[PDB]
Every structure is written in structure tokens, then in C-alpha cells.
Amino acid sequence: MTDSIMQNYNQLREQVINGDRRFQHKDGHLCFEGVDLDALARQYPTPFYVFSEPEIIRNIHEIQQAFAAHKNTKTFFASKTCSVMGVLKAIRDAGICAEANSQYEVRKCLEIGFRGDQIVFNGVVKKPADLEYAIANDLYLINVDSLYELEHIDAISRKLKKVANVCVRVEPNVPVTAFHAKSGLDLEQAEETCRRILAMPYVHLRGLHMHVGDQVPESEPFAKATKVLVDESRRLEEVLGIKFDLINVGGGIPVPYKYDDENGDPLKDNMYAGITAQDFADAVIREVHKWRTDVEICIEPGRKVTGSAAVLLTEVSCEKRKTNYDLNGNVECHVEWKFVDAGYSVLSDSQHFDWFFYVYNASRMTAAHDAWIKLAGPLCDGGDYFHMGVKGEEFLLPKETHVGDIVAFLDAGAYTIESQTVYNNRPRTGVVMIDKNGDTRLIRREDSYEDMVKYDIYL
Amino acid sequence: MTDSIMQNYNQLREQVINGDRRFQHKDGHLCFEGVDLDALARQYPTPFYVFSEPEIIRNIHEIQQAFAAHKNTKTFFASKTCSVMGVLKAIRDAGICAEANSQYEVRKCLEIGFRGDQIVFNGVVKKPADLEYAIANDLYLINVDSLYELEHIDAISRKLKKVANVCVRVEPNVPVTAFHAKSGLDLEQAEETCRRILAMPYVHLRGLHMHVGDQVPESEPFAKATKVLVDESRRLEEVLGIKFDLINVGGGIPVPYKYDDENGDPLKDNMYAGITAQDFADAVIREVHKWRTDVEICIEPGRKVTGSAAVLLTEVSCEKRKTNYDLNGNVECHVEWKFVDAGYSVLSDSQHFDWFFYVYNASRMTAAHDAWIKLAGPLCDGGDYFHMGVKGEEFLLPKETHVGDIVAFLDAGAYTIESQTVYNNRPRTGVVMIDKNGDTRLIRREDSYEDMVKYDIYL
């Protein structure tokens, strides 16, 4: 019933401001770590993202606590999730390490203060220049994704006379893997890869690596895939006469994007998180301890560290009513369009990956969200409106919603910044940080006009 | 039959190098306007786009020739399609005008040499600062998209004491329009909007505006929608006692992305262009001439100007074979993966809009493309491979294809540059131009490391 959906959404709204560790209300406005978000959006031009260092810390503590029973566990934040320097600084200051996915990501992590022995470099295309930069900076791990890439690692480590620390990435076939997974080696190739590495003077084999996927909604895939990696690690220790330093089990811990679990099925709608960080650790640690309790476990969480820790703030900038009439002139329906100053060039996954984010009127957060509306962006593009609504393509906002109100998208902290574009020559957004003491500062400027022509060469 | 698909694709390959106005072959390499693309990709680091000024001129001449029977026709390139300054310069030098979709797009068009009276500014979200910039620079047209926006235009034109030239955008319901079209006013609102404008001292009503869509595969939608705009233009001249300057019919002329029309259905697969520029003009001019033969017709083509006029060049940077085995150890299939140094962060529409682009080995363009392969990008993301293949997700390349070969994506000139991202901190690409004399120059640099941290604020 449309009634039950509206009631349910407003119960969720009341829970945001009365039972959520991240949020409060003051003067009718949504607050984030004590910061009035209506007022904040009057200090900085919209649209912009605002991150919470407190929530990043909470997410890291959840992950670390999940692995308490295995003392030798190292956590590497997957920086492709978000690499604004102030966010990386917060993750460093919380005490964990960094995973990097290109040459420039390695360099950024070094610049912001991660030591080489706190960085893992992963990739399917690591060119000689990428490998030379990584080996020169003594990284904790460089993953081996293919036999072709291993030839370069051998040649370059010999040239630099510096040891390359490596893990061999294996992708288990856990019921297509050949046809759908570009990453890693087949299980059948792990032994010959490790044998080749053991003969190289300046390459050090540290263990095996896998990564099963993103926003994973059940625990058995981590468990079955971890068992495969563990069984092969055990067998290679015996066959090759060695003892591995570590096993790297990757990332994939999901984040709740819809919270009413009683009303969802994570296997049909993975906006419902199927599992928790504790379920992930329970799967990994149990399978590893069938082999060794002392070996180091490496994990590479991305989404879980930052996903819940940002909000997108965007101003209602225009409004219109459209009306469909039949042939006799009678009204078929009214459509209430609200236009915000952020579109899919700002929030890419709302279009390209059918991703749901909670939407509320932050200026009227204690008011009933009782009007069905369609929410559009500012791009000159018929497709730039938000399709992932509360009911179909329709959202709920207070009927009193006014141009100038601030709209908030929740859970906007993962894969939302580096994926922005300058389509229509609208600038990529500023980013604000709420630090752990509750104070705010700008950590990324909005693209300026100059920024957008400076790459071009012209008279 | 898989046989017939392979034969057909190689007939298309032979047509590229023996019957295409854009391309030739030399020393086994694909050439573009006489430029060896293998050699060009050794001068500039891949991946990069290369545009052809000759082909841009050819596309403009097609459009202009299509409208020969209506002398008073003005052509505005939709710059959201591609706004690299060197591409805008080529379009200016070919003699047409410019359509702009944000404040910064207006400013760019002015900077590269378009006069104010050569610029149309369109948008659903034109804030006071956007309107003030536009009115101050005496633009040919600012479109009116909503009653709310018209209040700002009246106030700001009075403040500046400068006339704002406007067209009223109407979106016809041509069999949902209320529910799926965010842009424009209802037909029923056109009269009251025009009446309001006629009473404003510093606003000048020039006519009505529509835009039906992108890559439109039949002519009847342009014809029915144009008739609606024409019938309302006629009626308002009578009711209001005026004579319009113009009628603006927008863009939407399609580009062929698959060329074997004998084997396609444009209504099921709009990679087949359903119509030509001449079909578009035939629809528009016939409907307009039922009202007036002297009125100015404005058109706003985007894709058609640049789509066919660029190639994406990317190096084969890694290779691997993956193999699926059954429970008895026998081989089910081999999968040959080829990795190029461009992924969906470089060519966005290949993922987000299921767009097809022809793919060939430019280093081996005269060789049979006889091996089924899967083509992957460099991003640390399981989804970063090209899904829109020759047969399903599979592409055809010569079996001899080697790391270091240059792969070309054809028809890569529309909506491909401003949509790039810095995901994984891989840089947005350089862009090269072949000028009308056949010589090459860099017109956009590749993003540098510095470029990618300079927006951030950190210690």
C-alpha cells in the first residue's frame, strides 16, 4: 500500500534523528556529529560532500574489533574508495594501513604519511614505470596478477637491486569464473608461479591473495573462497618446503544502504547488507585457523570504512508542476518536479549502478515527508534525474518544501568523489570534513573555471 | 552462425581501410586522414583520443547542405558533446555557432571567439549568478524552462538594464511526458508565459524551443513534435498580435555506430542510425513551411558534429589465458583476456549506457581478425571490461595480437572527454588533433600527478 510505504519512510526518518549514532536534530534541521547541516550549507556553496571523521573511526573500530580473536591481523584501506588527502589522513591517524590501485595512488599514500611497509599495490595492468616506482619505495606487498607481469617484476627488481615483496593473486572458481573474472591466476597456476618466484634473487614471496567482490550479501562466498586459498597455502608449504608470511583475503564487507532489514531480502536487493564485519571475520578466521593460528591475515576493506561517513548536501534550486491531460481535457495526473543543484555528474552511482541513497529535506527534517515528488538534477540531459526512489522513481519530501531548502543524501562516502565528472562543464564538488572534535574545514575545493580550461592547449 | 559473424566483421574491417572517407592503411597500420595511428601512438603516451578536423568539417557540411532549401537557418553546436578548446575552435572556424549548457560553457565559448550573438544558453537550473553572466554578455538566446526561472530573468535584466533575448521551451506530449520529461513547459502554459514576457521591459521574446532527444532512430517524432511547436507558434502570433523571430527545434540527429544497416533494426538497436541529417531537415522544414517560409530556423546538433570524428587509441598492456575445468579435469573452455590501458573511466558510455564502438587492432589492420577474445581495462574493479562486443561480450582480434599493439575504438568523438573520471587515480587522457592540413598537435594534456592532488587542502 502507498500508505504503508509513506508511514514506513517517516518511521525511518524519525529513527535518523532519534536513534542514529551519527545524527541529531536542532531547530528542525538535520545535524551530523553536532553540526547543523542547513547552516553548514549556507557557509559553503552547494553541492558539496561532508565527511565525518567520528564515523570513519567508528567503522574502523568495528572492523578491528571483528578480528580480535586473531592477533596478527593487518588492515589496509582500499583507497580507490576515497582518496581525498584529508580522508586518507583520517584513516592513517586511526591507525590502519593503505591499499593502492595505481602509481599515483601509491605516491599519494606515501605523501600523506603512510610508510612503504604500510602500502599494498594491487593491479591488473602494472606497467614497468608503475613497478619501478613501487619497488623503489619498498612496499609491503605488490600483488602478482599474471605470468606476463612477473617477468617485469624480476627484471626491474634485478635492475634496482631492491627486493620486491609479492603476493600471488588466485581467483577461486566458487559456484563462469574464466569468462567473468579478469583478475588473478587460476588455482592450477599458483604452484608454477610460486616456483618461479622462489628462483628470483630480488623477489620475496609472502603468500597468496584473493578478493571476492563488493557489497557481498552472504558469508558463505567468503568462507568457501577462503578455504580454497587456505588449502592451497597449506599444500604449497608442504610441496615447496616453505612457511608463508601471510594470507591476504581482500575486501567486500557490505554497508547498509536500506535499514529496514525486516522488510528486505539481501539476495534480491543488495542495498540491504546481508552480513556484518563480524560475519566476515568469522568466516575468514575459522578457515585460516584450520591451517595456522600464527600466520598474518591481511584484509583490504574499502566501502565499509567510509560509506556511512558522508552526506551529499544539495540545494533545491527550481521547481515545476507538469500535468498530463486526456483527450477531453481532464487531468490524468500531476507531477511535482524538484530540481537540486547536484546530478549524476556529482553522484555517479545513482545512475550508472542503480544505487539507492536515503533522501531527506535537511532543512525540514522534523516535518512529515508526505508529498510524492520527482527529483531532478541540473544537467541538460533528459536522463539526469534520480531514478532510485522510495516507490519506483518517486521520492517523499515535505509538501512545504521550498526553493532554497537543503536536501541530504545519506551514506554517500564510498566511490562518490573520484567518480565525478565535468559534464556540461559543471564543476566537481568541494568536500568538507567534520573532524573528531566536531569542527569543520574544507578539504577539497570546488573546481574553478580556470581549473577546467587549464588542461587545454590553445591560443 | 559464429562463422557468418566473423566473416561479416572482417568485411567491415576491409571496408574501413578501402571504402571509408576517414581511413586508409599503410604498412599494415590503420591511418586517419593520412596519419599512421600506430606511429602516432608511439609519439604520445596511450591512452589518448585523436580528433579529425577534416571529419568535423564533413559532418557540418552534411548538416548545412541538408537545410539548403531554407535559407534562414542557424546552426548551434551543442557543446556538452565536446568542449575541448581546440575542438570548439575547429567548429567556430567551420562557420557555425554554439549552444552552451552552463555558465562555464558560456564563458568558454566567448573565450574561444564566439560572439555573444552566436551563443544559445539552455538549462533547467540557471541560478541568478548564471543568468547575470549570460545577460551581461548579450547572448543570442537564453531559454525559458520554467515559470520560476522567468522571475529571475525579469529581475536581473531590470537590474542590469540589458535586454535578455529568450525562447520559451515547450515539451510536446507525443505518444508519460509529465512523468519522464523534466525539461520545458507544458504546451498549455506557453501562452501565459509569452504574455508575461511581453510585459517585461528588458526581456525580448524571440520564439519557442524544443529538443526531442538523442540518437533518434526515426523521423516521425521530429515531424509530429515540430508540428506541435509550429501550430502553437502560429496561434500565438494571432492571439498576441506579434511575429516571431525564430523557432528552435533542438538536436538529436543520430550517428552510425554500426554500419551494416542491411543486418540491423534501428528501432530495436539504436546503434544503427535510423535516419540521416537530410531526413531530419525534411521533417523540420516541411512542418515549418506550413506556417512561414521566412522565419529563422535554429538547430542544435551535438553528436552528429563530432561523433564520427575521433578514435580512442589504447595499448595492449597485458594478456592472460583463463581455463575452466570440469570435475574430471577436462577443459570446458579457454578464455583469452587482452588488457588495454583504457577502461570505463576513460570511455564512460561503454559501461554506463551500453554503447557500442567498433574495435580493431590498428597495428595489424590488414590481418584477419580471427580470434575470439575478451577485452579488459586497467581498473582494479571486476566490472571494468568491455561488455558490448561483436558477439555478446566477445571481440575479434588477430590471433597474432601482441602486447604493445595499438587498439582503436572508432566513432569516439561525442560525450567521451568531459565524462572521464580519475577513478583509481588514473589520469584523464590527453587529446590530439589532426588539423585540416593533415598535421597533428596536442590540444589537451594528460592529467599529471600534481593536477590530481592540487584540488585538495592538506599539510
PDB file of N, CA and C in Angstrom, chain B residues 100-137:
ATOM      1  N   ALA B 100      25.319  26.360 -25.353  1.00  0.00           N
ATOM      2  CA  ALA B 100      26.029  26.214 -24.087  1.00  0.00           C
ATOM      3  C   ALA B 100      25.059  25.788 -22.997  1.00  0.00           C
ATOM      4  N   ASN B 101      25.575  25.028 -22.035  1.00  0.00           N
ATOM      5  CA  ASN B 101      24.743  24.323 -21.077  1.00  0.00           C
ATOM      6  C   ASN B 101      25.136  24.602 -19.632  1.00  0.00           C
ATOM      7  N   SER B 102      26.009  25.573 -19.403  1.00  0.00           N
ATOM      8  CA  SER B 102      26.292  26.066 -18.067  1.00  0.00           C
ATOM      9  C   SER B 102      26.964  27.419 -18.197  1.00  0.00           C
ATOM     10  N   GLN B 103      27.115  28.079 -17.050  1.00  0.00           N
ATOM     11  CA  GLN B 103      27.830  29.353 -17.020  1.00  0.00           C
ATOM     12  C   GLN B 103      29.252  29.215 -17.564  1.00  0.00           C
ATOM     13  N   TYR B 104      29.965  28.159 -17.161  1.00  0.00           N
ATOM     14  CA  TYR B 104      31.353  27.999 -17.588  1.00  0.00           C
ATOM     15  C   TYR B 104      31.443  27.644 -19.071  1.00  0.00           C
ATOM     16  N   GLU B 105      30.425  26.959 -19.611  1.00  0.00           N
ATOM     17  CA  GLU B 105      30.366  26.699 -21.049  1.00  0.00           C
ATOM     18  C   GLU B 105      30.152  27.983 -21.845  1.00  0.00           C
ATOM     19  N   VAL B 106      29.298  28.881 -21.352  1.00  0.00           N
ATOM     20  CA  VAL B 106      29.157  30.186 -21.999  1.00  0.00           C
ATOM     21  C   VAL B 106      30.500  30.903 -22.035  1.00  0.00           C
ATOM     22  N   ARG B 107      31.183  30.938 -20.887  1.00  0.00           N
ATOM     23  CA  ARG B 107      32.441  31.663 -20.791  1.00  0.00           C
ATOM     24  C   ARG B 107      33.490  31.069 -21.724  1.00  0.00           C
ATOM     25  N   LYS B 108      33.554  29.744 -21.807  1.00  0.00           N
ATOM     26  CA  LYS B 108      34.495  29.107 -22.723  1.00  0.00           C
ATOM     27  C   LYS B 108      34.215  29.495 -24.163  1.00  0.00           C
ATOM     28  N   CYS B 109      32.940  29.460 -24.561  1.00  0.00           N
ATOM     29  CA  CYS B 109      32.606  29.797 -25.937  1.00  0.00           C
ATOM     30  C   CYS B 109      32.992  31.237 -26.246  1.00  0.00           C
ATOM     31  N   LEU B 110      32.763  32.153 -25.298  1.00  0.00           N
ATOM     32  CA  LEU B 110      33.198  33.525 -25.505  1.00  0.00           C
ATOM     33  C   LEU B 110      34.722  33.598 -25.639  1.00  0.00           C
ATOM     34  N   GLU B 111      35.445  32.885 -24.764  1.00  0.00           N
ATOM     35  CA  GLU B 111      36.907  32.951 -24.759  1.00  0.00           C
ATOM     36  C   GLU B 111      37.489  32.458 -26.079  1.00  0.00           C
ATOM     37  N   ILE B 112      36.906  31.407 -26.659  1.00  0.00           N
ATOM     38  CA  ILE B 112      37.468  30.830 -27.883  1.00  0.00           C
ATOM     39  C   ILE B 112      37.039  31.597 -29.126  1.00  0.00           C
ATOM     40  N   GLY B 113      36.163  32.592 -28.986  1.00  0.00           N
ATOM     41  CA  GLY B 113      35.937  33.560 -30.047  1.00  0.00           C
ATOM     42  C   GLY B 113      34.521  33.648 -30.578  1.00  0.00           C
ATOM     43  N   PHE B 114      33.568  32.882 -30.054  1.00  0.00           N
ATOM     44  CA  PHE B 114      32.170  33.065 -30.424  1.00  0.00           C
ATOM     45  C   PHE B 114      31.673  34.391 -29.856  1.00  0.00           C
ATOM     46  N   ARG B 115      30.993  35.186 -30.680  1.00  0.00           N
ATOM     47  CA  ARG B 115      30.373  36.401 -30.171  1.00  0.00           C
ATOM     48  C   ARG B 115      29.136  36.050 -29.354  1.00  0.00           C
ATOM     49  N   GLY B 116      28.739  36.972 -28.478  1.00  0.00           N
ATOM     50  CA  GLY B 116      27.507  36.765 -27.728  1.00  0.00           C
ATOM     51  C   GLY B 116      26.335  36.403 -28.619  1.00  0.00           C
ATOM     52  N   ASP B 117      26.216  37.075 -29.769  1.00  0.00           N
ATOM     53  CA  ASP B 117      25.105  36.805 -30.671  1.00  0.00           C
ATOM     54  C   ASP B 117      25.299  35.517 -31.466  1.00  0.00           C
ATOM     55  N   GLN B 118      26.297  34.705 -31.108  1.00  0.00           N
ATOM     56  CA  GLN B 118      26.441  33.359 -31.651  1.00  0.00           C
ATOM     57  C   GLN B 118      26.228  32.271 -30.603  1.00  0.00           C
ATOM     58  N   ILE B 119      25.691  32.603 -29.430  1.00  0.00           N
ATOM     59  CA  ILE B 119      25.603  31.663 -28.312  1.00  0.00           C
ATOM     60  C   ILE B 119      24.164  31.553 -27.823  1.00  0.00           C
ATOM     61  N   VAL B 120      23.694  30.319 -27.664  1.00  0.00           N
ATOM     62  CA  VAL B 120      22.428  29.993 -27.010  1.00  0.00           C
ATOM     63  C   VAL B 120      22.747  29.341 -25.668  1.00  0.00           C
ATOM     64  N   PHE B 121      22.074  29.790 -24.605  1.00  0.00           N
ATOM     65  CA  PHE B 121      22.255  29.234 -23.261  1.00  0.00           C
ATOM     66  C   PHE B 121      20.987  28.500 -22.854  1.00  0.00           C
ATOM     67  N   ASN B 122      21.097  27.184 -22.665  1.00  0.00           N
ATOM     68  CA  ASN B 122      19.962  26.357 -22.276  1.00  0.00           C
ATOM     69  C   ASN B 122      20.191  25.781 -20.885  1.00  0.00           C
ATOM     70  N   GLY B 123      19.100  25.493 -20.187  1.00  0.00           N
ATOM     71  CA  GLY B 123      19.233  24.843 -18.893  1.00  0.00           C
ATOM     72  C   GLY B 123      17.962  24.734 -18.080  1.00  0.00           C
ATOM     73  N   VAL B 124      17.923  23.733 -17.201  1.00  0.00           N
ATOM     74  CA  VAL B 124      16.826  23.612 -16.256  1.00  0.00           C
ATOM     75  C   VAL B 124      17.127  24.302 -14.931  1.00  0.00           C
ATOM     76  N   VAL B 125      18.400  24.520 -14.606  1.00  0.00           N
ATOM     77  CA  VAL B 125      18.800  25.157 -13.352  1.00  0.00           C
ATOM     78  C   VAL B 125      19.775  26.273 -13.727  1.00  0.00           C
ATOM     79  N   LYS B 126      19.242  27.470 -13.929  1.00  0.00           N
ATOM     80  CA  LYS B 126      20.026  28.667 -14.223  1.00  0.00           C
ATOM     81  C   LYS B 126      19.867  29.597 -13.024  1.00  0.00           C
ATOM     82  N   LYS B 127      20.851  29.580 -12.131  1.00  0.00           N
ATOM     83  CA  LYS B 127      20.785  30.377 -10.916  1.00  0.00           C
ATOM     84  C   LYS B 127      21.016  31.855 -11.232  1.00  0.00           C
ATOM     85  N   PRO B 128      20.667  32.746 -10.295  1.00  0.00           N
ATOM     86  CA  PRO B 128      20.886  34.185 -10.535  1.00  0.00           C
ATOM     87  C   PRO B 128      22.276  34.523 -11.054  1.00  0.00           C
ATOM     88  N   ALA B 129      23.327  33.907 -10.513  1.00  0.00           N
ATOM     89  CA  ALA B 129      24.675  34.203 -10.999  1.00  0.00           C
ATOM     90  C   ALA B 129      24.850  33.749 -12.443  1.00  0.00           C
ATOM     91  N   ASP B 130      24.249  32.613 -12.807  1.00  0.00           N
ATOM     92  CA  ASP B 130      24.313  32.137 -14.191  1.00  0.00           C
ATOM     93  C   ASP B 130      23.611  33.105 -15.135  1.00  0.00           C
ATOM     94  N   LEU B 131      22.427  33.573 -14.741  1.00  0.00           N
ATOM     95  CA  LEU B 131      21.650  34.466 -15.589  1.00  0.00           C
ATOM     96  C   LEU B 131      22.309  35.829 -15.719  1.00  0.00           C
ATOM     97  N   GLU B 132      22.879  36.333 -14.628  1.00  0.00           N
ATOM     98  CA  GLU B 132      23.533  37.632 -14.674  1.00  0.00           C
ATOM     99  C   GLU B 132      24.727  37.608 -15.617  1.00  0.00           C
ATOM    100  N   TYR B 133      25.510  36.524 -15.587  1.00  0.00           N
ATOM    101  CA  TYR B 133      26.627  36.410 -16.517  1.00  0.00           C
ATOM    102  C   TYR B 133      26.133  36.380 -17.958  1.00  0.00           C
ATOM    103  N   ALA B 134      25.058  35.628 -18.216  1.00  0.00           N
ATOM    104  CA  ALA B 134      24.561  35.479 -19.581  1.00  0.00           C
ATOM    105  C   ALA B 134      23.992  36.789 -20.113  1.00  0.00           C
ATOM    106  N   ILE B 135      23.172  37.468 -19.307  1.00  0.00           N
ATOM    107  CA  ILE B 135      22.531  38.698 -19.763  1.00  0.00           C
ATOM    108  C   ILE B 135      23.571  39.783 -19.994  1.00  0.00           C
ATOM    109  N   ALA B 136      24.592  39.830 -19.139  1.00  0.00           N
ATOM    110  CA  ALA B 136      25.645  40.825 -19.279  1.00  0.00           C
ATOM    111  C   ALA B 136      26.418  40.679 -20.583  1.00  0.00           C
ATOM    112  N   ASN B 137      26.399  39.499 -21.203  1.00  0.00           N
ATOM    113  CA  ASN B 137      27.194  39.240 -22.398  1.00  0.00           C
ATOM    114  C   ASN B 137      26.336  39.138 -23.659  1.00  0.00           C
TER     115      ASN B 137
END
